[PDB]
Nucleic acid binder design. Sequence first.
RNA 1: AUCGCUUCUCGGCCUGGCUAAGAUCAAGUGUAGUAUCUGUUCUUAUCAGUUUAAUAUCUGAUGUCCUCUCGAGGAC
Length: 66
Amino acid sequence: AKTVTKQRVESHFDLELRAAVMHDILDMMPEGIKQNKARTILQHLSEAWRCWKANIPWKVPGLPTP
RNA sequence: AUCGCUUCUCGGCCUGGCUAAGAUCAAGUGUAGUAUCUGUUCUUAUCAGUUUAAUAUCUGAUGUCCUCUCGAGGAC
């Protein structure tokens, strides 16, 4: 396996961040619910970070609290 | 066999990572003439003048005498 050098820091961190969020999706969702929609949650996370970078108020009007 | 619930098959119907938003930029004439957008356009009465292939344009009065109170009646 390749080491994490300097030019491979930032993207790898994002990759690891994505993986962590994916794990925190898969044990938060209760019994049932076939549509996991984890890609939509990752898109929401990317949009929330992009709204944090531009100091834009980020609020999805309907979104589950956990 | 009717009704409600659960499950599955089939038919039209929402559905692409990260970084410094990853970064940066972006030049023609002049004179005539034509065409297309957009706006303004066209109902008052016959006749005469001008005009015209003809229309259009174009300048002039748009039922008279008497009486009563744009209206009515009388030999008309």
